[PDB]
Write a structure and sequence with these properties.
2 copies of one chain form a homodimer. With about 550 residues, the first copy, chain A, is mainly alpha-helical. Chain A is built from 30 helices and no strands. Chain A is about 70% helix and about 0% strand. Bound molecules: phosphatidylethanolamine (2 copies) and 2-acetamido-2-deoxy-beta-D-glucopyranose (2 copies). Chains A, B: One of its GO terms (cellular component) is plasma membrane.
């Protein structure tokens, strides 16, 4: 029974020991940079193990930094709540606003009518629409939005009888069937993948954009919003299609002509007509567009286009027009939220003022969304988690440990650049797979910045592939909040998820390694050589 | 039927008209100070009218200020997490932690045992314990904690047959009768009143302390933690006691024995012994004190002690001990939160494996508090409200509103100082009566500071009484959240509460006007004479 104590109490022992075990690192060496390293290491161990609730560990810098003497208490508390975080919160709130009026259901059904009711065509349509959705909102919001539609469509096919929701016929909740697992893992993976396309979709893009633009004010290259799309989208398409093919083969016998599941998908092909009838009758059941949905759509489109035109390459941009003070992208999303609270819902009140119509509303007209709804659904804990990364970045920069570790990693000079790039990709993936993506990106990026400063490489040549690499996380439930939500709301098991995750990782390293060296040259032909403006920085350091 | 239109849809009209109607303010006068004036006025009129939800309107500065050119967008978002805010949020969290383990029940029952069980003594005991609890934590959490205890007690008395909580069946929610009205209003008023006690009682104290420290740094006086308590406590005891007496007279038949309420109280006196049996039997039912409660109590006391002495003082100032960089009071509360997450609940597991006596737990022991609980209880909206208040204060200082309005009120020098102080108190209370406290403090403090600079009057002499008075709100449900919670919990017709408000307002005004002039001179010696360091700023302006 001495083993059972280890079985049911392992989470506590790690908390008790790890600070004590790692205590000597401060004591032996002198500089407070070692104290910063101690804090970073212990916080990382808590993150990866999930001994404490994941959010609460991010609070530690508040007590740590003033005691360690690294940074003043007032500034450290200030660093959490920055404009990017406001953008992210506004995005989540407007996504809930979309969810309120059921518009996503209509969009899904319309796409289904477009594609048809064949099983593989169904899967392809869902993957593509999920990618398109997640290109421009929060990933956790995207998957939470889309999942109930998924449950509805497979329970409709349950009424059809082609598939089974749970692998066992209810024999802990029962294991889901291969088909259901395929659908849920597909939506999760596509949701995660979509972030790489656009700056706005996932916070990691914003974080390393901020880090790079902070370190080098004098960079000739710009990392512009249209150019970021031009770099990102082709690879995005290639590996999302490859992930589709791999997932289809792994679960449904796509390229295996003979399988028991192949008979199942052929049977699903047989009942195409009845599925078409249930789908188009179901669409008919929704009814014509209400106004409510119409202005929701208008606000969403306005928000996206208003992001697009903030000093773009082709256009002058409104930011230059309103050059009174520097305005970030936080303004449009909050503008949308406030208006979404202002505007009415049905406009029936207009009947009394001028119209001859009969009906008149009895009470106050409800607005688009109600604060009672917003409080319950949004995951408020994310603010601390996002703030922790900024706190760590600022602390590491001011304490100077980044310079120490960068000058420590100086032996890599002998290697040719391409193999160094491969090593960078591999280490970035390995680090990401064990925590939240934003935190890992904030840890990793500055030391590579200083490394490139030292080992005479153009910095962006490593920074951009690294930042793109930080996004993927495919085989840990704790790795990425969309994966956590998909673990919820369903009965997926960790081992099967991990073994399914082997494909997309291999695919994404291969495709980044291939397209970076080729496409970036077209995007930037100066990455290979070392520019003079960076030589000035090197001389400065 | 057009009467029904204005009766039902006025909230939309105010939103549509007021921003448009108040437009000429910026058009007629060129200075950006008037733009800031317009912003402040429209925000305030939205606040008082409650057309929009209270929280959402405070978002407006982060969109208005970057466009209007007063201050950059980055700074505005930075203001929303000044350390006082995280201190307040942590205070709410630890209050929930106390709530989780039923400590308040034990405290209330013990105090009831100490005082007695006669009706008037019962009411007095509840009032005193409510005040003592609200001494240290946020007011909304305090009243939300204390509310169901009163429900239980009145249910007990209903079982005894002394009185009925409901007024009458069918004379829409039922009307409450006198006794329950008295009890609930006592709870609300006592909570709000005792919140005035110390620095940590309510966000207004933190707000105006921070403003005073920011505007003036060379001043002799400091308003550290002990001195504020010394200035405040003697007054709060007096007006709390007088409030108790007034509530006894108005609702409970104190001095009028030839009244119907006198006979019911007399009937209550005979049955006091049976109620004593019920009370102490119920206390016996609750059982002995567990380790859980002991731990949470130790953490609470440790937190308050760290506040008391760590900051500069005669004995054992730990801030002096760790003075590499200045550390504020944010550390202890977040320390308590994270520590409260770390510790276990039972200790049976660890001790039992070594001890070998007693059952082995079959699962991991839960921590003191669970993030699921924190998710659904904290009023997360308060962050935006406090941020809006801070933003308004900073913007008014930056743009030049304060200097203009202070110079505009230059004429008030003719009146004697006591009369001026009385006018300040009266106007402060009247403005507090409309909207939330922290907003009024933010609007009022800076203009008073600049005016007192102009009139050559020691600024503390006015700023402290006004800051104390801003807490006092006793009339309308929108004025302060505890009133809303009470009115919602048991339906209260606002007419009765408004009528009952006439007592505490008069009592508080009189006792403040007397006790300031008496006690402040003792605690602060030089208030009457204008100090030289203020004259330096006077020449600076
Ligand atoms: C100068 C730099 C400063 C940096 C500061 C950074 C912030 C703070 C960092 C940490 C500081 C030390 C904190 C120590 C906390 C110990 C918690 C022990 C919890 C515990 O007993 O867990 C059990 C195993 O540990 C054990 O068996 C533990 C053995 C010892 C138990 C007795 C502990 C007594 C209390 C010690 C704290 C001081 C007094 C507080 C009143 C397993 O239990 P489980 O599996 O059920 O866990 C379920 C999850 N909770
Ligand atoms: C060159 C000058 C530049 C100046 C710049 C500075 C000033 C800028 C000011 C911007 C103000 C924007 C205001 C937008 C909202 C207007 C108010 C609408 C209120 C409303 O719906 O009222 C209804 C009653 O009818 C009414 O109140 C009757 C009027 C209805 C008007 C409808 C307007 C529709 C606008 C277009 C909407 C669709 C497109 C959106 C992009 C419902 O009132 P209620 O009380 O029942 O409900 C209240 C919510 N629960
Ligand atoms: C302040 C600074 O960095 N100036 C440099 C300048 O010396 C250099 O000639 C030019 C070309 O890269 O880039 C820029
Ligand atoms: C503000 C400044 O530059 N110097 C002041 C000095 O005028 C004043 O006499 C002294 C008293 O505290 O504080 C310092």
């Amino acid at each position: 029974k001495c083993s059972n104590f280890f079985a049911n109490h392992w989470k506590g022992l790690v908390v008790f020991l790890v600070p004590l075990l790692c205590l000597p690192v401060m004591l032996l060496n002198e500089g407070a940079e070692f104290r910063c390293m101690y804090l970073l290491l212990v916080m990382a161990i808590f993150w990866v193990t999930e001994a404490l609730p994941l959010y609460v560990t991010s609070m530690i810098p508040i007590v740590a930094f003033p005691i360690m003497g690294i940074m003043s208490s007032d500034q450290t508390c200030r660093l959490y709540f920055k404009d990017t975080l406001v953008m992210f919160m506004g995005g989540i709130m407007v996504a809930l606003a979309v969810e309120y009026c059921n518009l996503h259901k209509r969009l899904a059904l319309r796409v289904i009518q477009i594609v048809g009711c064949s099983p593989r065509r169904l899967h392809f349509g869902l993957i593509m629409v999920t990618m398109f959705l997640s290109m421009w909102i929060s990933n956790a919001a995207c998957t939470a939005m889309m999942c109930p539609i998924i449950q509805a469509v497979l329970e409709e096919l349950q009424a059809q009888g082609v598939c089974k929701i749970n692998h066992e016929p209810q024999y802990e909740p029962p294991y889901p069937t291969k088909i259901t697992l395929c659908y849920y893992l597909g939506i999760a993976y596509a949701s995660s993948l979509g972030g790489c396309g656009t700056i706005i979709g996932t916070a990691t893009n914003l974080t390393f954009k901020g880090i790079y633009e902070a370190r080098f004010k004098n960079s000739t290259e710009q990392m512009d919003f249209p150019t970021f799309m031009f770099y990102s989208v082709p690879s995005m398409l290639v590996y999302t299609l490859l992930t589709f093919v791999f997932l289809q083969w792994h679960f449904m016998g796509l390229w295996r002509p003979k399988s028991k599941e192949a008979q199942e998908v052929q049977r699903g092909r047989e009942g195409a007509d009845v599925a078409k009838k249930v789908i188009d009758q179901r669409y008919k059941d929704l009814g014509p567009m209400s106004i409510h949905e119409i202005q929701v759509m208008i606000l969403f489109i306005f928000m996206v286009v208003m992001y697009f035109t903030r000093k773009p390459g082709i256009f002058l941009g409104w930011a230059d027009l309103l050059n009174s003070k520097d305005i970030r992208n936080s303004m449009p999303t909050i503008f949308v939220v406030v208006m979404c609270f202002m505007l009415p819902a049905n406009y029936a009140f207009l009947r009394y003022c001028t119209r001859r119509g009969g009906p008149v509303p009895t009470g106050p007209t409800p607005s688009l969304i109600t604060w009672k709804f917003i409080q319950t659904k949004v995951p408020w804990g994310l603010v601390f988690l996002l703030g922790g990364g900024f706190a760590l970045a600022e602390g590491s920069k001011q304490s100077g440990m980044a310079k120490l570790i960068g000058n420590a990693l100086i032996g890599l000079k002998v290697l040719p650049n391409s193999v160094l790039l491969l090593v960078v990709i591999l280490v970035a993936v390995f680090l990401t797979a064990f925590s939240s993506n934003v935190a890992i990106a904030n840890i990793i990026i500055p030391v590579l910045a200083e490394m490139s400063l030292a080992i005479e490489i153009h910095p962006l040549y490593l920074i951009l592939p690294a930042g793109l690499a930080c996004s993927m996380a495919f085989h840990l439930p704790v790795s990425t909040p969309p994966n956590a939500l998909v673990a919820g709301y369903a009965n997926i098991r960790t081992k099967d998820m991990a073994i399914a995750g082997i494909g997309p990782t291999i695919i994404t390293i291969i495709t980044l390694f291939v397209f970076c060296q080729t496409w970036g040259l077209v995007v930037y032909p100066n990455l290979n050589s070392f520019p003079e403006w960076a030589q000035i920085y090197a001389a400065a350091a």
